Design a protein around this ligand. Structure first.
Ligand code: NAD
Ligand code: NAD
Ligand code: NAD
Ligand code: NAD
Ligand code: BGC
Ligand code: BGC
Ligand code: BGC
Ligand code: BGC
Ligand code: NA
Ligand code: NA
Ligand code: NA
Ligand code: NA
Lengths: 257, 257, 257, 257
């Protein structure tokens, strides 16, 4: 009952982290609108979960997002939380093999989708004293190899969260982000499958955390429910869900030349 | 039922933040041992709360802490979480009006109490796959005026949390910290009362947050319950409970000379 | 003679921070190519400074940037350092008064100009074991009010710096950023002049630093010369030139409701 | 001539990082007082360097430090910069194999020496508008395995730097810190020699940086000269001299259990 009577929109909710967030909010007593550009996972998740419904919506298409918000209000009468999870991490990219246009397209997906839904939702979040939860990444904070465009998008989302938190604080709307590290999801599995030795890639991903495993969508989901339902004095924070990957020395490459 | 069947020790649990943490854990279904050097608040809190008991214990006295742990195990059979909250913030201190011996004494209270209880508890936390929650302060991260010794103690606790998280990760024990900013507590009230204009001091404390208010012990308590019960992929994190005080420009003091 | 025999490109070098960086590098013994979209300041700066020349170049126009690099190599025979300073901070913008297209255009200027010049320069920087210096902003790290798009661009630049530092480390090319806070420049003066009380805006900008003043272009310039010429074990750092603005509590807005 | 006419005290200046800092300041034109508890290296360094002198002084002995300051003023007439470098990193320590008394002793050396010299020097630094440079460590920020006491001391020094920067800002005295990562020094060599495979320990230390090498005392020295002589708008900063060790994923330890 932690979030009973509340209405939550989760983008990219059809699989992976987003589906974990959907499940966590349903378990907390909320009604959830699952947004995804792909029907397959999200439609099944509506059938499975009483209290969740699915709306086909590509966050890069502003009229899809306008309809997502208007339909949420028409069907459920209020909006308390938006979780901006839709996004993508490309395969490894050497800097010289990226392009400005590819970078613009990744910004469109990973940064401007979040911007667009947040802007359309905010009038309703002000009415409910609701909150925004943005998914970013640990790599926005610490960098990553072979991911210049992706890392830039994560740095932008984390910073944008802080700016919007300042702007919406007089209106009672909190804005926070979750920065996952390595979470085992279909995207992780798909990216590993492109590598010459998928098994070694997965093992390396596990051992990047002091805990020696990757995280689960359910763990990101619990962090989101905390931010929405109980973190009433938290705004503009970056909640790390990383298993300690940012801690200590690790293998990153006369002794001093 | 989020933390049902678990046993939690909260130091400095007799009033303020610590009492808020005690209440949050009892509400989650845990049994709580309240440690405090003062009988007054903690004894009343035992009488009030089914599931909480009080043990008189000064965290700077190592034999008090040894008995705290042995009595917790004797009475309740397990130990799942220690919350190291006991500590003190002095009134404003100009750097030249501090002393090395006063600094040692503040380290003894604010840093070594945490160290001692954590060390004595860890064998039992390993058995239960339990966790450590250290209270630090935002000022460890950003500094504060007229508080050189206090700020150093907070910086030490936050860093120590990360080191111990690394060391205990192979044993399944998570170690995290909460960094509050301005939380309205008896200590805040007592410190304000020493100022020439207590009301103006309190108002300044409120306006240090974009949210325009101070936080509550219950809000720190909810963050602690999250870290203990649901943050299974979080270790070595610093969870800010600060109302946005670290965000944006504020009043800190030709245009460029 | 700290950077004698070296060749440096500074974008937005015609006034403000960029001109301060140009002057610092000339004083260190380097030859400097001043890039700016405006002829006025940069042309005068070429006439003033032996060792600096001016090339008209808008960093958002990829063929301008290609010619900037090819002309630098044709005229001077090597390239050791690029300083990505060109960019803009808009006047205050409420979140609901921004647009996705305006945000894309600010990303084009503040993020993709840096990306484009860096990509074109890197083959030459690899030959010279040179380095990249990106100008970002403190507000990328801490947020700012009424600046969602700008803050996002700064967060992106700082993060991108870290990613590229990782990628170029095996090739001996360091990539660092400087995050200024409040630096007194023509842009600061122009923005203040748009406010209802310019004098009060300037005073507030000065008092945002514990030092009680804004910084100077020459101070950013000295930080850039350090990063280029002497910081041989620094890569992926964010060097704050902020006068302490990020430190301590300040004015950001019952006591706890 | 960058720091000509200035007087600098460097503690632990007889070897390692401290000796690199001494050399950098002498090369900048300053007169340097080398403090060390051991005569061997520091006495030789006085004979070698015109402009450096050696004073035997253990920073944990407050009367040694009082005499260090009084002798500096008696002999040279002013004091412009103190570099608090003296300290020690123990061999690896499991948390359960540390003691409160050992922790107090390490705090005495690594934190309170810095506190004591800074306090005694500050009246003279106010007269000269001088500055304080504290050596800390990257591990204060990110943690390290098998080093709970050391990490706590580094976290304390970094935080203390920020607090004192706030307090001394109205008096024109800047206070900054340098956080080295892995610097090849006699201490590093001695610690490696205690390991079962010293060569493998050294190689692991080198590969902890994306740059693939450890840093040099001269590189820390150049950072110190920058902070003293040219960083006039920097106060309360943590200048990382780490070769990128904090960046990206590395080896820190079903895929998600
Ligand atoms: N998995 C990790 O380790 C990890 C780490 C840090 C950040 N992230 C981020 O978290 C988010 C989820 O990651 P994941 O691993 O679950 O990915 P995933 O690919 O498994 O799931 C992403 C979901 O979002 C949907 N989606 C993609 N583009 C969309 C669009 N334009 N409009 C609407 N829906 C869209 C997909 O169809 C899919 O159902 C992503 O933004 C990712 O970048 C993931
Ligand atoms: N209130 C804030 O804004 C704030 C902000 C950041 C950090 N903190 C820290 O949080 C903790 C709680 O703060 P608070 O405001 O609730 O303080 P408080 O003084 O109101 O409560 C502290 C409690 O700890 C007990 N205690 C003190 N020394 C002890 C010892 N030696 N052994 C056992 N118990 C001891 C006290 O008797 C009291 O019941 C402190 O460590 C404080 O430094 C407080
Ligand atoms: N002044 C501050 O307090 C401050 C703080 C943080 C960051 N910054 C950033 O530092 C940089 C310099 O700031 P400033 O205050 O000196 O600004 P400024 O406007 O005074 O100077 C900017 C210079 O860059 C040039 N420029 C702008 N767009 C360009 C383009 N497309 N191509 C080439 N040149 C271009 C301008 O013509 C001008 O000469 C900017 O990126 C700004 O966002 C400034
Ligand atoms: N080497 C690294 O990788 C590294 C990394 C981060 C921080 N640090 C810190 O930097 C400092 C220098 O490290 P190093 O590797 O050069 O060490 P080092 O042991 O080689 O040199 C330390 C010097 O300080 C002196 N010293 C020690 N205790 C003293 C005391 N009580 N009073 C006066 N002088 C004293 C020693 O005699 C010696 O000459 C230390 O504080 C260390 O913790 C070192
Ligand atoms: O595909 C990898 C993992 O993705 C997660 O989102 C699913 O919940 C898991 O069942 C699956 O193993
Ligand atoms: O004394 C200030 C505040 O302290 C808190 O710990 C109590 O819960 C409040 O009731 C009280 O107003
Ligand atoms: O316009 C504000 C300031 O801009 C700086 O770039 C110039 O160097 C100053 O002379 C001027 O006062
Ligand atoms: O002992 C390791 C290294 O220590 C440094 O301080 C010295 O400058 C080097 O010559 C030496 O190789
Ligand atoms: Na359903
Ligand atoms: Na009870
Ligand atoms: Na010229
Ligand atoms: Na000499």
């Amino acid at each position: 009952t932690r979030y009973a009577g509340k209405v939550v929109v989760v983008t990219g909710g059809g699989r992976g982290i987003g589906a974990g967030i959907v499940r966590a909010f349903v378990n907390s007593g909320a009604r959830v609108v699952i947004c995804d550009k792909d029907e397959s996972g999200g439609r099944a998740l509506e059938q499975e979960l009483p209290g969740a419904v699915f709306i086909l919506c590509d966050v890069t298409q502003e009229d899809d997002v306008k309809t997502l918000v208007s339909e949420t209000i028409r069907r459920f009468g209020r909006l308390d939380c938006v979780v901006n999870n839709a996004g993508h991490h490309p395969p490894p990219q050497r800097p010289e093999e990226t392009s400005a246009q590819g970078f613009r397209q990744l910004l469109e997906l990973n940064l401007l989708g979040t911007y667009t839904l947040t802007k359309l939702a905010l009038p309703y979040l002000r009415k409910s004293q609701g909150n925004v939860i943005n998914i970013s990444s640990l790599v926005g904070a610490i960098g990553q190899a072979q991911a210049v465009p992706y890392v830039a998008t994560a740095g932008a989302v984390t910073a944008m969260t802080k700016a919007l938190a300042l702007d919406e604080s007089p209106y009672g709307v909190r804005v926070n982000c979750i920065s996952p590290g390595n979470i085992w999801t279909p995207l992780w599995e798909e990216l590993a499958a492109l590598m010459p030795d998928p098994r070694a890639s997965i093992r390396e991903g596990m051992l990047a955390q002091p805990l020696g495993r990757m995280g689960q969508p359910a763990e990101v989901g619990a962090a989101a429910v905390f931010l929405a339902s109980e973190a009433n004095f938290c705004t503009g924070i970056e909640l790390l869900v990383t298993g300690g990957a940012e801690l200590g020395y690790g293998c990153k490459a006369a002794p001093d030349i």
